[PDB]
Design a protein around this ligand. Structure first.
Ligand SMILES: CC(C)(COP(=O)(O)OP(=O)(O)OC[C@H]1O[C@@H](n2cnc3c(N)ncnc32)[C@H](O)[C@@H]1OP(=O)(O)O)[C@@H](O)C(=O)NCCC(=O)NCCS
Ligand SMILES: CC(=O)NCCCC[C@H](NC(=O)CNC(=O)Cc1ccccc1)C(=O)O
Length: 159
């Protein structure tokens, strides 16, 4: 793996919008979105958020993330963390989270990164645990079927 990163561009939107494979995946990474995902929904998130970044390997956009929240001198919250299905388990999200942590420190002087994860998303919970995030609270949310789910709020000091 020879990963690089850059800010997201318009031309990346169709590829990134293709990443969520089912309603569950979309809900995990973008719970306010509606299935099917679309480039217009992705572009609306980008416009509302900060720090939209892609990860690239061998000429392919394989990952995307942004900041859900940003508070100068305080914290950022990671959002919209998505990886291309063919490139899952290869370190793309680990790489991009490291990039985003640097960006939070450098641009926002953040002391902390917040990352929330839905309970069903075992891969995510284990990912963030691996990266040094600790659980802090659990909030009730509802999925598109009106069923109760648990949102696990985690954080990590940035140093
Ligand atoms: C969750 C997701 C972003 C992980 O991206 P990824 O690039 O595949 O993850 P990485 O390869 O960087 O793996 C980093 C760590 O995440 C965890 N992880 C990733 N995929 C996993 C899987 N299928 N099962 C268990 N743990 C997993 C592991 O702890 C892994 O560390 P390890 O490989 O050293 O054990 C990706 O599966 C995805 O896009 N899922 C749908 C969108 C989503 O859920 N995003 C929001 C998460 S809050
Ligand atoms: C890093 C990453 O991609 N994590 C996945 C979880 C979602 C991350 C983030 N939301 C939040 O952190 C919190 N926002 C919410 O809970 C919004 C919500 C609204 C209605 C029902 C459920 C949920 C986001 O919208 O990107």
């Amino acid at each position: 793996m020879q990963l690089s990163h850059r800010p997201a561009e318009t031309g990346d939107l169709e590829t990134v919008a293709g990443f969520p494979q089912d309603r569950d995946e979309l809900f995990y990474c973008y719970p306010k979105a509606i299935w099917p995902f679309s480039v217009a929904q992705l572009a609306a998130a980008i416009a509302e958020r900060r720090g939209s970044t892609v990860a690239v390997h061998d000429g392919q956009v394989l990952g995307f993330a942004n900041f859900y929240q940003w508070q100068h001198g305080d914290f950022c919250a990671l959002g919209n963390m998505m990886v291309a299905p063919a490139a899952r388990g290869l370190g793309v999200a680990r790489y991009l989270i490291g990039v985003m942590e640097n960006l939070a420190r450098e641009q926002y002087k953040a002391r902390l990164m917040k990352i929330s994860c839905f309970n069903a998303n075992a891969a995510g919970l284990l990912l963030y645990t691996q990266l040094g995030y600790q659980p802090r609270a659990i909030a009730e949310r509802h999925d598109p079927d009106g069923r109760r789910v648990a949102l696990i709020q985690m954080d990590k000091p940035l140093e």
